[PDB]
Amino acid sequence: EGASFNLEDSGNFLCTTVAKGDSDFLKRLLSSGMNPNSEDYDHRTPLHVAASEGLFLMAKMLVEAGASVISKDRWGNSPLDEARLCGNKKLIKLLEDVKNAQSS
Amino acid sequence: EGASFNLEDSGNFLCTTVAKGDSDFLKRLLSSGMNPNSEDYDHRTPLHVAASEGLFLMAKMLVEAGASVISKDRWGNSPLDEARLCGNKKLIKLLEDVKNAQSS
Amino acid sequence: EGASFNLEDSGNFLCTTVAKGDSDFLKRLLSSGMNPNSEDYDHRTPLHVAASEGLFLMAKMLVEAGASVISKDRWGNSPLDEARLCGNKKLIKLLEDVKNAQSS
């Protein structure tokens, strides 16, 4: 039927979802077509917060859905920079290569 | 009712559930009751693969289920040393605590 | 009519059919063209495990229908390295011969 969630603070609720680690629920939203680029109040994408939490897999679903790595939070760091902050080497490497792809 | 898995390659199936990142599957499984130590064809417990991927979240669930840490691998790689190989210092310390408890 | 396997856990599947003793089942996979050097969660090719197991005829047939002796696992160990770890001089000899043949 081509419906959409159309939820207020959809990106902020996505950041809360990443906070709760609802990986399957995140995947179902992104399969339906929810925007992972939509950030929270602090301009943090769900990719931003997931990278800050070292959620390599969850950030990878976010990347597949198109969560922007070149986007910047309220502090002005990309999700990749949040990955460097957390130190999750796997998610750090994934986030390098996804940012490099997005730069084109 | 008392239903039981009794699955063939239950060690391998557990290890693949670990490798495929099915955290909710593990939750239902630990809730259902399942040896957190069943070894695969390479004699690896589920927590072996959990630490080899540095899955501090999922490995923690196996630790909660009481996953064996002292048990080594076909190469001498205990899941504690698997976490060391991955580089998850947090998981290294967690598995170190569990293994030091398991010494007795 | 153009069928295929499309099975997941292909590395698990191959390593197990070699290990469980149903190498005829493995041969039936190879009849369909299933690549023995399929992806594994630990990068364990079936011949790795088989050579380190101590059985010969099973790894023998597996490598007979094709294999990768120079394939590395997640530790970088080759099936020949696993034969060396097991010290299976018969497996070591066969695997060295196939390794040289492959490298050629």
Residues A15, A16, A18: CA angle, nearest 5 degrees: 65
Q: What is the resolution of this structure in A?
A: 3.2
Which chain B residues have a beta carbon less than 8 Å from that of C50? none
* Elucidation method: cryo-EM
Q: Is C78 exposed, middle or buried (0-12, 13-18, 19+ CB in 10 A)?
A: buried
First-to-last CA distance in chain B? 35
Nearest C-alpha neighbor of C42 from the set C32, C52, C28, C54: C52
Of A21, A57, A89, the CB nearest to B87: A89
What's the first-to-final CA gap in chain A, in angstroms? 34
Residue with tokens 């760091």: A77
Q: Do chains C and A touch (3 or more CB pairs under 8 A)?
A: no
Residue A24: which of B24, B54, B57 has the nearest Cβ? B24
Residue pair A93/A83 in contact by the 8 Å Cβ criterion: no
Beta-carbon separation of B21 and A57 below 8 A? yes
**Residue A19: partners with Cβ closer than 8 Å, 6 or more residues away:** A49, A53
What is the distance in angstroms between the Cα of B20 and the nearest Cα belonging to chain C? Answer: 8
Residue with tokens 């929810």: A34
The full length of chain B comes to: 104
Taking the C-alpha atoms of residue C23 and residue A15, their distance in angstroms, rounded to an integer, is 49
Structure tokens at C68: 């990768």
